[PDB]
Design a protein around this ligand. Sequence first.
Ligand SMILES: *[C@@H]1O[C@H](CO)[C@@H](O)[C@H](O)[C@H]1NC(C)=O
Ligand SMILES: *[C@@H]1O[C@H](CO)[C@@H](O)[C@H](O)[C@H]1NC(C)=O
Ligand SMILES: *[C@@H]1O[C@H](CO)[C@@H](O)[C@H](O)[C@H]1NC(C)=O
Lengths: 50, 57, 9
Amino acid sequence: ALQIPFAMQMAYRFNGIGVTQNVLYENQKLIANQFNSAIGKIQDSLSSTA
Amino acid sequence: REGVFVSNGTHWFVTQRNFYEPQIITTDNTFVSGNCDVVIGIVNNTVYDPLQPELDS
Amino acid sequence: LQPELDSFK
Ligand SMILES: *[C@@H]1O[C@H](CO)[C@@H](O)[C@H](O)[C@H]1NC(C)=O
Ligand SMILES: *[C@@H]1O[C@H](CO)[C@@H](O)[C@H](O)[C@H]1NC(C)=O
Ligand SMILES: *[C@@H]1O[C@H](CO)[C@@H](O)[C@H](O)[C@H]1NC(C)=O
């Protein structure tokens, strides 16, 4: 295991889907809120007694 | 353009992810976009330009 | 680059 700071850990994953990593850093705040926001809904999806 | 930025204490370099092959930072292997006002973790440094030595040479 | 310099020095 080699430590990789999470900032550019996502960046390489973006390179793996044909997206330039420059967009991520310019949109780091938006992605973080979007990721956390999604975690909010997924929790309620299971808690909704479905 | 490829790999990540590394520094042996004070001298920054560019190397591929899966091996340590440090190289001098250059415009050819580092695509530039935007300005260093929104990226978190930017580091001030000069980027060697191969054209300048060739200019007037 | 070499021909470019030669074309215009
Ligand atoms: C880091 O690497 C450069 C590259 O040659 C070298 O000059 C320098 O002594 C090394 N150490 C530090 C602390 O910069
Ligand atoms: C890294 O984290 C430390 C403390 O957690 C903080 O002081 C520093 O500004 C951070 N740097 C970057 C580039 O995020
Ligand atoms: C980096 O350079 C900019 C402009 O040259 C300057 O405003 C800033 O204070 C420098 N240092 C940083 C960003 O740590």
